[PDB]
Amino acid sequence: PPLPFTPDVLQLQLEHNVLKGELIDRLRALEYTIVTEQLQA
């Protein structure tokens, strides 16, 4: 196959779903901080 190993689809969807929210929640914090930069600018 293309891969050399057997991925555990449950643990990958777990990390993917957890990491997705951490990225969206990070962008919301950055948009929150950009508001103070486009005010100071």
């Binding site: 643990q11 990390e15 990491l19 951490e22 990225l23 990070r26 103070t36």
Partner: protein
């Protein structure tokens, strides 16, 4: 000597002086407190939460 006097010990005129002085002080306290410190600017600029992500792989 003139300032050596018991009349000048409890002089009501100086008491009026003190009264008006400290009433005006009280009136102007909220303007004495109106000095800005730049410490929360420092906290906003320098406080950086850990932005690294978790990666089990």
């Amino acid at each position: 000597l003139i300032p050596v006097s018991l009349v000048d010990l409890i002089n009501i005129n100086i008491i009026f002086y003190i009264l008006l002085l400290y009433t005006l002080l009280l009136f102007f306290i909220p303007l004495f407190l109106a000095s800005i410190n730049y410490t929360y600017h420092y906290i906003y600029k320098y406080y950086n939460y850990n932005y690294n992500f978790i990666n089990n792989n």
